[model samples]
Structure formats: structure tokens, C-alpha cells
Target: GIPYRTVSEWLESIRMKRYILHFHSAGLDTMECVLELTAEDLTQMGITLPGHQKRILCSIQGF
Candidate 1:
């Protein structure tokens, strides 16, 4: 099996599945980009919630 899952799967695992469309639309779906995401990137992606940013950043760091 592959060591990594798709961006949608990772988002679902983090309870952030709703952002799948945003990520895809922004061309940020690849694991490389997702893993390198920052708070600024989240904000640009319309994910301005502090809690949401924290959750996503934490999840990315965990990978």
C-alpha cells in the first residue's frame, strides 16, 4: 500500500473534509503541497478560522 493517502482522505481524517473542494480548486491537493501548508496559505484558501488553521497545521506537522 502507499505510505500516504489522498488529500481528501487526509482532510477527512482531520474532520476537515469540507475543505476538499477548496484544496482541489486551489491546486493544493498534492501531498507535497498539503504537507507544506502554512497558516497564511490556509487564510488564502478561505480557511481563516484560528481553530481550523491550528488543526490543519498540526495535522500537517504530524505527517
Candidate 2:
């Protein structure tokens, strides 16, 4: 099992519900895959905000 926060929780923190929809649409259906999301994946998901990307990636990298 992964040690990071749930994708729902982390995405919620970023206040970007569209990311959630995009993630699910992209078939990243588990917390494991979410925690493993690369910068490219985030970018592909349209998460372009530097702060948002940093917060999400940094939080996972922290683990």
C-alpha cells in the first residue's frame, strides 16, 4: 500500500475538481496510480498552475 494521501484528499486541497474528473477519465483509478503520477501526467491532465503542480508533486515526493 502507498503511504501518501488519498487522491481525493490531495486534489481537494488543490481545489481543482476538474483534475479529479480528468484523472478518473484517464483511468487512473487508484490511489497508487495517483501517487505515481508524473509531471507529464499532471500536465496532460491540464494542471498548469505552477503552485498547484508543486503542491501536488511535492506532497507526494515528501513521502
Candidate 3:
């Protein structure tokens, strides 16, 4: 897996992300997708996607 914490710190710390999300998704240019988004934008996007551990339930799910 990619060390996303490095990218999450922003450009000041890391020049670029190890893995590009847009690259995985077809028909989307790198410029078209904005990595740095505001709190409002995050809410609007509804991007409560997958993660190793669920915030609500702290358990080891072998899925």
C-alpha cells in the first residue's frame, strides 16, 4: 500500500503523491481532479469510502 500520510501532509512536505487516484480511474485527467479540497467540498462529495479499519467499529475484518 502507498504511504498516504506523506501526501496528506501537502506539497510543503511531499512534492507528489506516490500513487495517483486519478490514474486508477479512467477518462479523468490529473488536472481535472483536485487533491486539495476544502471541508465544504469534502462534505459535498460524500467520499466516506473504504479504509483498513471502520471508524465506528474497531475490529479486524478479513474482507
Q: In terms of lDDT, which candidate is strongest? A: 1
lDDT of each: 0.82, 0.72, 0.29
TM-score of each model, paired residue for residue: 0.87, 0.67, 0.24
lDDT tens per residue, model 3, 1-63: 122233223322333232234223432233323343443443344423333113211211111
- Who is ahead in TM-score, 1 or 3? 1
**How does residue 47 of candidate 3 score in lDDT?**
29
Ranking by TM-score: 1, 2, 3
TM-score for candidate 1, please give it: 0.87
Q: What residue runs in model 2 are displaced by over 4 Å at the alpha carbon?
A: 1-5, 13-18
lDDT of 1 at 61: 78
lDDT, residue 60, candidate 2: 69
Looking at model 3, report the run of 10 residues with the lowest lDDT sum. 54-63
User: What's every prediction's RMSD, in angstroms?
Assistant: 2.1, 2.6, 11.6
lDDT of 1 by residue, 1-63 (tens): 223568877888889998888898889867777767789988999999999999988887777
Tens-digit lDDT track for model 2 on 1-63? 355356676567557555787778788766687767777888888777878788778766766
- TM-score, candidate number 3: 0.24
lDDT of 3: 0.29
